Amino acid sequence: SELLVNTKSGKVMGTRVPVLSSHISAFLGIPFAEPPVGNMRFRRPEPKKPWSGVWNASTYPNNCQQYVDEQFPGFSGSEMWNPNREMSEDCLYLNIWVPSPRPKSTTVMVWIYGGGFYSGSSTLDVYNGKYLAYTEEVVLVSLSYRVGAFGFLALHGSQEAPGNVGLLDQRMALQWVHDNIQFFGGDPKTVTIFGESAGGASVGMHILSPGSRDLFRRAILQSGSPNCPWASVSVAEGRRRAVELGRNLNCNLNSDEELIHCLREKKPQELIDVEWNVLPFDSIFRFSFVPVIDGEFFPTSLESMLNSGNFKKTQILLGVNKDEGSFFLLYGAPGFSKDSESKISREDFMSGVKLSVPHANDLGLDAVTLQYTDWMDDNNGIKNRDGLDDIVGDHNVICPLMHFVNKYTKFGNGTYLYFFNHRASNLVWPEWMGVIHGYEIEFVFGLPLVKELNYTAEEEALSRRIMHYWATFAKTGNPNEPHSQESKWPLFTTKEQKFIDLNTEPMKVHQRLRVQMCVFWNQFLPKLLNAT
Amino acid sequence: SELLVNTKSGKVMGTRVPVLSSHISAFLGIPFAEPPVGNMRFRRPEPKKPWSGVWNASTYPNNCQQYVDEQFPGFSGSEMWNPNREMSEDCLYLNIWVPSPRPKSTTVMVWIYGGGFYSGSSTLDVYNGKYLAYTEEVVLVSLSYRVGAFGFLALHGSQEAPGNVGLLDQRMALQWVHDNIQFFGGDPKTVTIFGESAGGASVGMHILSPGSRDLFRRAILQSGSPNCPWASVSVAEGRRRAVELGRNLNCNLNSDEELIHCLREKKPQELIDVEWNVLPFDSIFRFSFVPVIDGEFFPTSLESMLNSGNFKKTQILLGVNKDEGSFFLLYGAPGFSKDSESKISREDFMSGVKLSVPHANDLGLDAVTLQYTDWMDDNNGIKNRDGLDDIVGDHNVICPLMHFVNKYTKFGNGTYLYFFNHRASNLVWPEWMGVIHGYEIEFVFGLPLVKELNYTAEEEALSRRIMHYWATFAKTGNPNEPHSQESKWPLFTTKEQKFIDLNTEPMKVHQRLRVQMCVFWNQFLPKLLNAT
């Protein structure tokens, strides 16, 4: 039967799922690791012991233990990102959508969810791989990985809680895909990893980490890159947060062994309840437990790896959304609310600047403020609002990515860059938030093709164009069809810095994505803070 | 006779001069001080001893000893600013144009020439007061003052060369006008001083200096303000330059008395020949011998005087030209030449940035470069040229003036601000230099009314409008006619920061003259240099 697949770990039985008047196969909740529970909490993942009998792969697995957004109870705009299955520490599972009839050896895409390394689920409605797998004839995998303290508590030098284990979870899923996807009709040597936000940064981190490079062919990064200021901490800072966590739970702090032991007796929600108290600054766009630059997973600093070409050399496709900042300003910054226009006073602008660049001294904040203020009109609340939006997105997403782009391209084999600036017509978040980060995912996963979801015709066209770009790139390393028309997505190069925008209008090519602001963020402001 | 005036210093006989098909009286080369020659070189001026008989005031006096521009021999664009009379240390004279028949008690305007405190002449063709005096029925005075080492060699604590004596020359001329202008039909209590460039800065310095305030009613400043970075040095820096000068002339440097004595035995041209070797930095827009903040003429620093309201409170009218920077880039910066378009490479841009901000460290130069570079297009030689033009003008003229404007207005009785951006149709300097500083003077002195000078009709209109603004302001403290139409030059205020532009188009009102760049120059860059 087409729903039964013998893998090196044992047999699995999937389920036929309907999709757009046809059907395909889905194998849901396949374990790729031992449950990281009990004395294995905080440990590196172990491979799943093989099983006899048939593993029932017909339903979604649990989601990992995580903070749950209750800012807007009942609001679909926020609820659509919360876990939709029971949370559990037993959560290391993957899901596979397979064209029907089963391919013999086709392109494979593996999805890595975002969520600030503190949240995320493989089972969200908007991550349903059936439309992509069916439309583009790819084998679609989504993995899972521990988040929060469970994934990234870092007590460096200890083997019980070394850090980065959520990243090692991702790699174990990629190892399982490498070893077994051939039995689902996938080509293990044509695997594209792709992810958004912290998943985009995760993708970039596997490009860098030597122990991950050989497990995939090429990479797509959306709204995230490994060098983002929120995506890693030093070994000393990871240590400090781990101790501060045990201090919040009245733990014995006399040794790593005492500390880790206390944290493993706590119920998961006790860890989640205090996770946010360990941050060093009053800040936005910063998360407690994130990857650590440990000298093992990352051999040296990200910047010297980027400078020296110490990373996988392949093709990449990556890009950003227009309004990366609005979500985190909405949730953490004074003056912004969901039900108003969020016109920002000059005082609230300055508070926002302080929260957005928490490591800066006063001279640095003056520089950021000068850079983003229209001094002909400094009390325009629209401009103050949009100015803060740009500050948060430039600093945390766009300019880190553009730095990564420019360093990668010197050594890589092909870079394609996009700027997604279409705002979906059925968006429930207020207009002032614009093209909100994560809201290209639904176009990538093909949701506008489902008519009951009330997208425009042009949005359906845009989704089909994006899905065909991502899948053609996965298959060939180039998002363009060889011998079709449609104006070509140009290669990003060191001299042109060409990119396209993605929206419902006929595509245009531009150059030097936000170069003016990113010279400020990537070159000037670091030198200023270094001097003061 | 109308050409004979008995003054408190003795009788003077002037000359009838023709002007635009009529005539007026001119009294040229009236001495207001003893010749500052011999052992009086570098000394404070002494008042002119009265004379018997009639002083022949029918011809222009000598000009003061000064550096003479030979960069473009024969070129009228430069030659029109050089001395047109014999140079001599015997040069403290003034000139008066008087309407005919002689007024009984009319508005008085006193002109102070610019020239970087190192040059200038009261007798230039473009300073001919007959058109203004005749057209606006004012009594027009132009004074003179020592420049160069002769005017500003500063050995503080010495009474033989205390500094600022060129400024004291100006004040002695103003004292003479105060005491005697009534006999020429002038109203001594309605005197307006006005000057361009270093003369504008001179005007501002008399506003500040307590010993000058009572000698005039109101003030006009063109393209200069007392706080300009080139317009003053500290007492220690003035001392260092004075010693460096004597060192260039093999002077005994064991004491102030030995040093001053050696400098007084040198012929004037020996001083001029080495004057430029004493500058501390490789720089543009900096001059060797300039006013010194001495604790007497200026009681404390200019900035604390401005902050505390320690200055004359009256009405002022002031403004700038659009392209303040081009002259000094032409003369001192690599890549600029008179006969080409002066498209600037990125290397020459950076050299220019270094010359323009000589006191800055590398972080500061990076800030200036970032601020003025279009990073979408950083190899456009037009933009690099115009960018450097703006750097030089913003830093040296516009943003100092705007700082002065904003500090003065908090305490003054009326501020009018202008932006002169008409380029004269008969300008011989190349197009890339734009609206060059000093080239509003000819409109102020009414030269477009002389038909043989080949101005357009509209330029003649513009000159008449400007002359009527300056003279109405001098008479009343407001450049607008009470009960005429013509859209009104608005008052500059702390909240609007309204100004007008002056050109041949129907005037427009704007707000916040170059506020974005001047927040950089006046607030950010000082705090950055202070921190590094």
Ligand SMILES: *[C@@H]1O[C@H](CO)[C@@H](O)[C@H](O)[C@H]1NC(C)=O
């Ligand atoms: C697989 O598990 C689901 C979970 O309830 C169950 O409903 C389904 O019948 C199972 N299928 C089997 C055991 O074949």
Ligand SMILES: *[C@@H]1O[C@H](CO)[C@@H](O)[C@H](O)[C@H]1NC(C)=O
């Ligand atoms: C990709 O690699 C091949 C061979 O390694 C090379 O011929 C080709 O030019 C590369 N493409 C780019 C864009 O570097």
Ligand SMILES: *[C@@H]1O[C@H](CO)[C@@H](O)[C@H](O)[C@H]1NC(C)=O
């Ligand atoms: C005034 O001086 C000039 C200078 O040469 C002379 O030509 C003129 O005749 C003199 N007028 C007198 C002395 O009345």
Ligand SMILES: *[C@@H]1O[C@H](CO)[C@@H](O)[C@H](O)[C@H]1NC(C)=O
């Ligand atoms: C000028 O001064 C007078 C009285 O000193 C005052 O009534 C008037 O308002 C002042 N004008 C301005 C613009 O300050």
Ligand SMILES: *[P@](=O)(OCC)N(C)C
């Ligand atoms: P991403 O993972 O999405 C926010 C939850 N972010 C850039 C951290």
Ligand SMILES: *[P@](=O)(OCC)N(C)C
């Ligand atoms: P100004 O006096 O004119 C240049 C000779 N300048 C701003 C110093």
